[PDB]
């Protein structure tokens, strides 16, 4: 156990990027780039966040680049946003209470105590609703905070308010959003110090993602509908929403998009004359391919810059699959938009023109890798590059003019040493009978990691509308370092393969993806000539559901299994989950708020559940459950365990009393990973 | 009360420098300078410490200089030290427990939990003993931490160690050093991770201020004698000490200086061939003029580079009065030492040659101001400049070669806006009869602040071996902004006027400085033509003693008085304090550890105390006391309060249950200053 | 035991005890507001040994039926009351008053402090 | 307490008559005690002078309290001593024992000190009383 602990300690040392920004240009010309990183500290068992600054000397060419100091750790900062002119900086600090501070130069101008003013609830620090935008006149600030609930008192109170409403019910936004019922927009005036709440938001709509309108005349935001229920919003992009505009005074409200489809991620051009957002056509799957829509502020017209790619639009594009656009995504000319999207089994950067409509891949070609865009200001792009055999690295590039975007040169600000003991490849698989009639000819892919008589570990992704990409993954890397070949499968229904691949999966979950994973395993075993005696499985959420199916439907093909927060019965889950729609859609039914599932519905769900094969399982199973998982009730894993236990099947259960669907806490993640490795090693 | 609160809020916004360092030189040449600042936050009622980085492009000339980012607040950092080569950085973090972390590039290499290793007590964060020095081979670290006390248990303990020694007595180092009895030197090996305590320090000596010897063969430190008592060490530079060298292995110990005089602040030359320190000849006064001594490592010889100036050595030098030399003080040539010392009523920077022995003032001439040196590396000097009418500002300069040091040019990295409503001047006063026989012809000075029928506020300094300098003082500035002329008096016995001025005061405390302050007040009133009806006093500590003497001996000359932690009875003070020698020296008798005072000594201290003049006081008084004060016990003010209350004189008292001799807490300082200002405004 | 007392009324309808006085609320000069300012750290003298934070006691009377609490208004300003009991007929309160002018000398293990015996009517504040 | 004052007087004036001594919160210097206590009249009455609220003692009064204090006989003590002090004592301040301890330590006389950070003039806490009694018994048994 010492070697594995040392290996985990060594592999957890590498940091990861979190955000980036660009400073003002100084004529001596050169610019400063501020980078924020995160790392795992095992001695303290926490996530340490620090900052670092770099200097780039430019003449439309990167003349020079280098570091400009050391790394300073910061604690207690939730949200921050530099001024549009770069003069000031607004920071939110959680010192029990919440503070809003305005730094300028080398002194703190003023700090406001938000709690003692008694005007709203705690601020929002999430990414779905959290926002902090400076005014165009640089005199006001805007953010989103919880509403104020009227005070309540008990019936029997000793007095030297509403009585009896102490324990009323307030509904939250499902997973990982405890005690977040109805947000509201707050505007703070720096000079006077007053805080005012806007009075034009419709009653049945929760606002978010707000930013100031051109001219500082109003606020443009995205409104989500919460009538009559509040469905879960994490890892879901099919909730009904719209784009609204509200004047500061008078409470006038106006609608800017269709009200029967999800719209998200609005951004404003530097010319302050157009807005671009993402629109999702269907509401059935939790993740799909959206379209990039554009709205003209003056002409008051709407258009579709990009559309949904059915299978593939060329050999470089497959659709837009990003939930949130970058905070800075426009160009200096205010005519091009740069984003990052998955493509097949990798991630790439794309540039789209808002007039012609063409999409060009800047990172096209090569052997692979994952690219992520952090910011773009004045045609200067900051990018993080990662590959399965090298930790993430930082790069800075310049965007060339239109028509020659593919000839972009990068400068390496920070490069991390690679691991030359890991070799990765991508395999393309074609299904046999197993192909449907409506969608034929689709193919899927699998990523294989091998060292540069070998046991294998098979890992399907969750979702099921998610995907694996060739990026730096800690656990597959450490498993390969231990001596295990790792195979990550992207079955039919993943993201990055077109809309048809996503739409094929619903209604067939349980009998189509399992066969795909089994076929991939069989083909890899036949071709690469590994050890067929020792083959293991490992999965979470939907991956866990799949894993259980495989070990039951195919009894003598695996030698172990480590599942986490798995789905064991769809029927029982419906009444105990924040996203009851998922069950209906996946099973093949249309979710309806006003509907009580019949016997037919129940039957179908049970036939697709992996508990119907439980009596055959004979592979040792390691179960890890999060007592506070609100996406997949932790009772699901328990019922599978009981069955296997009664039939005397070796099962070990490790219940974490505070973990959720992600089990991301450093203490939980460190233990889970460690235990898993030992289990696999022992049995295999 | 609103105007005063707004004025205090405005004047407390200006930050203050704390430290500085210089980064490695990068050939594109330019360097990075790291500055640390501190500020007072009134909304949170705390002291906020943040960091900032600047870039200086040099060709022996400052070609360019500018900012290189924003300010990031850091919390939980106690001690830090960059690597000698600049590659790494060691930080001490108080995350309940104590952590020692080694940062390199953009990742934390390793962090050590010091408490769980169970090898020593908590580390030392003070300036007298605290030290953190990198090894010359860059592989080890050294620091100072409390010793390990053997575990103790009660007589009646339920068991499923020494019994009875639970409540033993451990003596501390007086004021502001609670629970600090016997420190020890600890050495940490970064590779292995082991911690070892040195085993050559003599039993009756407490070590500190350690640094690595040339060649990484031993440790050179300063040892303080604590036999048989532990006298107070804060604000005192007359404790017996010596310079010792201890080998890492074998416990060999060697002496490098005289053992009958105080020696402090040793530094090593970049050539690693000489050491320079400060030696104090006498032990009677708590602050005196020292001499700069030099020791050759190879030749094993000692010399006196500078000596004690009796009255004045030229029109630019008056002696060395700094307790601690800067962390970096040598030059590239390893032949010159730059320090900062007071001179008359200002502060200046001096450069001293270790071969010729001449001392040259770099900041000589001009109208005034206070200069402080933060660091000097490769002949690049970082300096803070402050004046009573402008907050501190940052500057960077280059040291010219020998013989032309006075022609130094400064570049302003950060400049603060000045206050043009304050005018300051320096007045020289000659005493009449009042002059002694042994020391005749001495003169003192006073700083006068007036706006650019005027009441005056007179402030004598504490000490009494301290001094006022023309620097940025918050309270005099805000009093002048309110409309009060402020007069700060540097009576005979202050620092910066030669050794004779310091030596004249002892034995005459109570009848010589009071007359000096009264003469200064009378001369200023006669000359400047202010309002003689409204004159107020405000002194702290020893100044309070002088203020009580003044209001007792001259009842019809003042209209108010504010005193913080005054000294009222020397005879009663002697029995309960950490510096019993102070009372004996000020009275006029030599202090002996093994002695008991007679009746004549008690009669002397009773005659010199201000309580003797208590039944003649007729001016309203306001007292501020710290219940946990250990230098001047808080009963001293209460007996004066009782005496004044018995005679029915208006007295107001404010007692702070957790304050100390300095009243340095943000809330305590704010409340005390506001109360004093309101009292002065109401009565005058 | 020096000042503590709890005595039932003769009509069995009231209770009497001794409790510390009420100090007016104080706030700092710089307080964030959605009282006396500056008097936060004022000095209140106690009764020496083993009587920390006990400056000026007062007599309180509680009516069991209604539930109201009333403080008596006849005690002299320069006297601290104690050891009270109900007068015959439930017409007044008889107590022992200790003098605390100008200082508050220690009272534990000391029986030489100036004192007197006082009688105060419930209504009207008459003292004898 | 006062018994400790008498015990210190006895071990000072008659050095060759006792073999041990245990004192808890003693009174060592009356003149220094007067300034810091809640009963300043006790010192004046015991010295022999009438106590007046509006008065300041002269040199003769200080001389009297200095002559009556046991510290005057400190350089003649030759018996091992054990002191127990309460850091929060307000009747007899805890510095009184510490000055005697310092004087005895300067002359190299075996002295043991135990300081209780939260005790009072009575040492009435259960743990404090148990520890003090056990330490006193062990000291007496070992030395005698
Ligand atoms: C959309 C979602 O969260 N599904 C769960 C079953 C799992 C975490 O996959
Ligand atoms: C050295 C000393 O005791 N100083 C106090 C009297 C005062 C803080 O000045
Ligand atoms: C009344 C008094 O001061 N007693 C102490 C000396 C001691 C507890 O006896």
Describe this structure in words.
- Chain D: It is found in: Cytoplasm.
- Chain D: Belongs to the peptidase S9C family.
- Chain D: The active site is at 1 (charge relay system), 89 (charge relay system), 121 (charge relay system).
- Chain D: This is Acylamino-acid-releasing enzyme.
- Chain D: It comes from Sus scrofa.
- The structure is cut from a larger assembly and holds four copies of chain A.
- With 684 residues, chain A is an alpha+beta fold.
- The first copy, chain A, has a domain at 422-684: Rossmann fold.
- In chain A, 15% of the residues lie in helices and 35% in strands.
- Chain A contains ten helices and 38 strands.
- In chain A, the strands form nine sheets. An eight-stranded mixed beta sheet of chain A has the order 31-32-34-33-35-36-37-38, sandwiched between helices. In chain A, strands 1, 2, 3, 4 and 5 form a five-stranded antiparallel beta sheet that branches. A four-stranded antiparallel beta sheet of chain A has the order 6-7-8-9, with no helix packed on it.
- In chain A, helix 1 runs antiparallel to helix 2.
- The two termini of chain A are 16 Å apart.
- The relative contact order of chain A is 0.08.
- Chains in contact: A-B, A-C, B-C, B-D, C-D.
- At the A-C interface, loops of A face loops of C.
- Bound molecules: ~{N}-[(2~{S},3~{S})-3-oxidanylbutan-2-yl]ethanamide (3 copies).
- One ~{N}-[(2~{S},3~{S})-3-oxidanylbutan-2-yl]ethanamide is lined by residues 235, 286, 462, 541-542, 567, 579, 582, 631-632, 661 of chain B.
- One ~{N}-[(2~{S},3~{S})-3-oxidanylbutan-2-yl]ethanamide (A1INA) binds next to loops of chain A.
């Amino acid at each position: 156990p010492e070697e594995a602990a040392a290996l985990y300690r060594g592999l957890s040392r590498q940091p990861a990027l979190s955000a980036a920004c660009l400073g003002p240009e100084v004529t001596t010309r050169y610019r400063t780039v501020h980078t924020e990183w995160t790392q795992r500290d095992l001695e303290r068992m926490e996530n340490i966040r620090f900052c670092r600054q770099y200097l780039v000397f430019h003449d439309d060419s990167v003349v020079f680049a280098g570091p400009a100091g050391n790394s300073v750790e910061t604690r207690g900062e939730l949200l921050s946003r530099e001024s549009p002119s770069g003069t000031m900086k607004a920071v939110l600090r959680k010192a029990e209470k919440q503070f809003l501070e305005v730094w300028e130069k080398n002194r703190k101008l003023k700090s406001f105590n938000l709690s003692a003013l008694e005007k709203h609830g705690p601020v929002y620090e999430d990414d779905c609703f959290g926002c902090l935008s400076w005014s165009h006149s640089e005199t006001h600030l805007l953010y989103v905070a919880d509403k104020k609930r009227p005070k309540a008192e008990s019936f029997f109170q000793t007095k030297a308010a509403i009585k009896g409403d102490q324990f009323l019910f307030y509904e939250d936004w499902g997973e990982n959003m405890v005690s977040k019922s109805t947000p509201v927009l707050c505007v703070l005036d720096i000079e006077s110090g007053n805080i005012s709440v806007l009075e034009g938001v419709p009653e049945s709509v929760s606002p978010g993602q707000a930013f100031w309108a051109p001219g500082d005349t109003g606020v443009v935001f995205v409104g989500w509908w919460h009538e009559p229920f509040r469905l879960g919003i994490r890892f879901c992009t099919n909730r009904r929403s719209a784009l609204y505009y509200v004047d500061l005074t008078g409470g006038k409200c106006e609608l800017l998009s269709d009200e029967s489809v999800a719209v998200t991620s609005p951004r404003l051009s530097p010319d302050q004359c157009r807005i671009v957002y993402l629109r999702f056509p269907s509401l059935v799957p939790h993740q799909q391919c959206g379209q990039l829509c554009l709205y003209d502020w003056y002409t008051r017209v709407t258009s579709v810059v990009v559309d949904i790619v059915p299978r593939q639009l060329g050999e470089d594009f497959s659709g837009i699959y990003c939930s949130l656009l970058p905070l800075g995504c426009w160009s200096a000319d205010s005519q091009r938009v740069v984003f990052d999207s998955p493509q097949r089994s990798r991630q790439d950067l794309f540039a789209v023109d808002t007039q012609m409509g063409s999409v060009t891949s800047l990172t096209a070609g090569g052997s692979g890798g994952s690219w992520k865009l952090l910011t773009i200001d004045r045609d200067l792009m900051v990018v993080q590059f990662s590959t399965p055999s090298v930790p993430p690295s930082l790069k800075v590039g310049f965007l060339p003019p239109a028509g020659k975007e593919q000839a972009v040169s990068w400068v390496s600000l920070e490069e991390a040493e690679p691991f030359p003991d890991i070799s990765w490849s991508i395999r393309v698989l074609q299904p046999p009978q197993q192909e449907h009639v409506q969608y034929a000819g689709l193919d899927f892919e699998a990523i294989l990691l091998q060292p540069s008589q070998v046991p294998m570990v098979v890992m399907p992704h969750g979702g099921p509308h998610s995907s694996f990409v060739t990026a730096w993954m800690l656990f597959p890397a450490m498993l390969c370092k231990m001596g295990f070949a790792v195979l990550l499968v992207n079955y039919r229904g993943s993201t990055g393969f077109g809309q048809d691949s996503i739409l094929s999966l619903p209604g067939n979950v349980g009998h189509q993806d399992v066969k795909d994973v089994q076929f991939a395993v069989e083909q890899v075993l036949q071709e690469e000539h590994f050890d067929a005696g020792r083959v293991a499985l490992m999965g979470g959420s939907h991956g866990g559901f799949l894993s259980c199916h495989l070990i039951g439907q195919y009894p003598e093909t695996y030698s172990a299994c480590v599942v986490r927060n798995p789905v064991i019965n769809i029927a029982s889950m419906m009444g105990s989950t924040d996203i009851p729609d998922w069950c209906m859609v996946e099973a093949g039914f249309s979710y309806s708020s006003d509907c009580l599932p019949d016997l037919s519905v129940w039957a179908a769900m049970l036939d697709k559940s992996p508990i119907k094969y439980a009596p055959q399982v004979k592979t040792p199973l390691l179960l890890m459950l999060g007592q506070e998982d609100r996406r997949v009730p932790f009772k699901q894993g328990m019922e599978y365990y009981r069955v296997l236990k009664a039939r005397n099947v070796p099962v070990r259960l490790l219940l974490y009393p505070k973990s959720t669907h992600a089990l991301s806490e450093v203490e939980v993640e460190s233990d889970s990973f460690m235990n898993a490795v030992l289990w696999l090693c022992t049995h295999l």
